[PDB]
A paper describes a structure:
EndoBT-3987 is a secreted enzyme that initiates the HM degradation pathway and hydrolyzes the oligosaccharide from its polypeptide chain on the cell surface. ENGases are endoglycosidases that hydrolyze the chitobiose core of N-linked glycans (EC 3.2.1.96). Residues 26–41 were not visible in the structure. The full-length EndoBT-3987 comprises two domains from the N- to the C-terminus: (i) a β-sandwich domain (42–179) followed by a short linker (residues 180–193) that continues to (ii) a GH domain (residues 194–476). Here, we provide the high-resolution X-ray crystal structures of EndoBT-3987 in its unliganded form, in complex with its substrate, Man9GlcNAc2Asn, and two of its products, Man5GlcNAc and Man9GlcNAc.
EndoBT-3987 has a predicted signal peptide (residues 1–25; SignalP-5.0) that was removed from the construct. In order to obtain the crystal structure of the enzyme-substrate complex we used a catalytically inactive version of EndoBT-3987, in which the residues Asp312 and Glu314 are mutated to alanine and leucine, respectively (EndoBT-3987D312A/E314L; see below for further details). EndoBT-3987D312A/E314L-Man9GlcNAc2Asn crystallized in the R 3 space group with one molecule in the asymmetric unit and diffracted to a maximum resolution of 1.3 Å. The EndoBT-3987 GH domain adopts the conserved (α/β)8-barrel topology typical of enzymes from the GH18 family, with a shallow pocket in which one molecule of the Man9GlcNAc2Asn substrate is unambiguously identified in the crystal structure. Specifically, the Man9GlcNAc2Asn substrate is located in the center of the (α/β)8-barrel, flanked by the connecting loops β10–α2 (loop 1; residues 201–205), β11–α3 (loop 2; residues 228–245), β14–α4 (loop 3; residues 275–286), β15–α5 (loop 4; residues 313–330), β16–β17 (loop 5; residues 355–374), β17– β18 (loop 6; residues 379–395), β18–α6 (loop 7; residues 402–411), and β19–α7 (loop 8; residues 430–432). The GlcNAc (−1) residue is in a skew boat conformation (1S5), with the C2-acetamido group pointed toward the mutated catalytic residue D312A. The skew boat conformation of GlcNAc (−1) is stabilized by hydrogen bonds between the O3 atom and the side chain of Y315, the N2 atom of the acetamide group and the side chain of Y380, and the O6 atom and the side chain of E401. The Manα1–2Manα1–6(Manα1–2Manα1–3)Manα1–6 antenna (antenna 1), mainly interacts with loops 1, 2, 3, and 4, whereas the Manα1–2Manα1–2Manα1–3 antenna (antenna 2) interacts with loops 1 and 7. The O2 atom of Man (−3), which bisects antenna 1 into two additional sub-antennae, antenna α1,6′ (antenna 1a; Man (−4) and (−5) residues), and antenna α1,3′ (antenna 1b; Man (−6) and (−7) residues; Fig. 2), makes a hydrogen bond with the Nε2 atom of H277.
Numbering used by the authors: 49 to 75, 87 to 118, 122 to 124, 132 to 156, 167 to 476
The structure:
Amino acid sequence: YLRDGKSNLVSKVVELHGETYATTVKMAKVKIDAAYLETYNKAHNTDFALYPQDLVTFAILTAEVEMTIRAGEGLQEDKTYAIPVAIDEDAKHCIYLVKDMRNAGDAYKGEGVMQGYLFFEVNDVNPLNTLSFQLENGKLLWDVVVLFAANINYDAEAGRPRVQCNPNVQYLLDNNETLLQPLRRRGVKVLLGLLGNHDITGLAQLSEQGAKDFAREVAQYCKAYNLDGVNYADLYSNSPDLSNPSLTNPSTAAAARLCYETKQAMPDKLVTVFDWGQMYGVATVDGVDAKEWIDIVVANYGSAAYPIGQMTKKQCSGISMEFNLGGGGSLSASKAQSMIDGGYGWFMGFAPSPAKYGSVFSRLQGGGEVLYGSNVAAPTIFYKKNDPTPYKYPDDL
Ligand SMILES: CC(=O)N[C@@H]1[C@@H](O)[C@H](O[C@@H]2O[C@H](CO)[C@@H](O[C@@H]3O[C@H](CO[C@H]4O[C@H](CO[C@H]5O[C@H](CO)[C@@H](O)[C@H](O)[C@@H]5O[C@H]5O[C@H](CO)[C@@H](O)[C@H](O)[C@@H]5O)[C@@H](O)[C@H](O[C@H]5O[C@H](CO)[C@@H](O)[C@H](O)[C@@H]5O[C@H]5O[C@H](CO)[C@@H](O)[C@H](O)[C@@H]5O)[C@@H]4O)[C@@H](O)[C@H](O[C@H]4O[C@H](CO)[C@@H](O)[C@H](O)[C@@H]4O[C@H]4O[C@H](CO)[C@@H](O)[C@H](O)[C@@H]4O[C@H]4O[C@H](CO)[C@@H](O)[C@H](O)[C@@H]4O)[C@@H]3O)[C@H](O)[C@H]2NC(C)=O)[C@@H](CO)O[C@H]1NC(=O)C[C@H](N)C(=O)O
């Protein structure tokens, strides 16, 4: 089979932060197969446009061949383009999903650095508070943020599980242009959190068909509200009704099915998991390795995440900080160096709030110098719930 040589993935998202991106295609010759894009889009129910062929150069396989992707100027941003490359019948193709991020760089801290993953308890805290967190050199600390959380619940009137949004979640989605998109314009990836919610449905207990449908609903939410993917957290569900065709016995295999189907439905977006309950641990679905469908795994406070399948620690958190309750440690110089030495890709934080910024920022001292050459700066603004106005920190608290 054919795959991208650097990631070993048959489907690879490329974010352009400069004018060029170089990789290999690994198996003969390779070619861009524009006709296949219709087949790919039909299979995934996607609508990616073909990346301009004149921007892609191959150095015949030597088997591998160098491929360079150049950034262009005619294209629409916040849009994913495709490079379908062709040498079972699937093993004849791989795909690059290309996004130009040159103008949405404020969270991009460089190649090979650790990245931040932050959950907001949106019942209480405006996610615009992401903007309170910058390094002294102006970069935004938190590459990825989660709206914690929409729920999975049974819709009795429709006879199926659904995404169920409480009034706070729904208000953010309804107001996404003013309360979520300002983050995306600056390069932050905004994920919808999904969480169990005290009925027969759960993220690790959907049947195969139930998981396919719920995955497709989650993808529809991410498309409609212009979001960047999902986090799944398998907590708070009750025992399933095994007589219900949408449900099955809770298991890591059922959870993996949901993750796999979600990536299939939104292959250019992030599929991420909290490692708790039955949400994580099975490394293959339908012969496809987990590196292709778990982009980020974050662990419970006080633990580090671990990779499965072909994943590495680059897809894993090395620290998880509970910013409301205090546990999980600090992102100190010594911890930052430890995590780099261990090859971890992420640090996770949960439930920061402006009233506790003294605590939160105390726990971010020293680490930024090690990770980025620039410490986290003291905050000067904050946001109130549901209010787009930047307020002065700490005076306006
Ligand atoms: C058990 C245990 O412990 N567990 C644990 C877990 O938890 C974890 O997890 C993880 O972590 C984190 C932490 O860290 C978390 O978070 C958390 O969570 C929690 C829980 O939650 C859940 O639940 C709840 C409750 O529920 C119940 O109730 C209700 C009413 O109330 C109802 O409705 C329901 O239904 C339920 O009931 C039912 O069931 C039950 C049982 O279950 C029974 O009993 C009954 O009968 C019935 O049936 C809820 O609420 C929640 O939900 C919510 O939210 C979400 C988000 O979050 C969403 O999604 C949803 O939707 C919801 O919302 C909505 O609704 C509500 C109501 O409900 C409203 O209100 C709203 O608005 C909306 O609408 C879930 O489900 C919780 O609790 C917590 O919370 C807290 O925090 C936060 C922040 O973070 C805030 O925001 C809040 O508010 C709160 O706060 C509070 O608290 C705190 C402390 O804690 C503080 O800080 C503050 O300040 C406050 O305070 C106050 O209060 C308190 C009391 O509470 C007192 O104390 C004080 O004094 C004051 O007053 C949080 O959220 C999470 O989840 C996770 N994460 C992730 C990432 O995922 C785990 C792991 O870590 O771990 C565990 N543990 C263990 O495991 C241990 C072992 N076992 C040993 O042994 O060790």
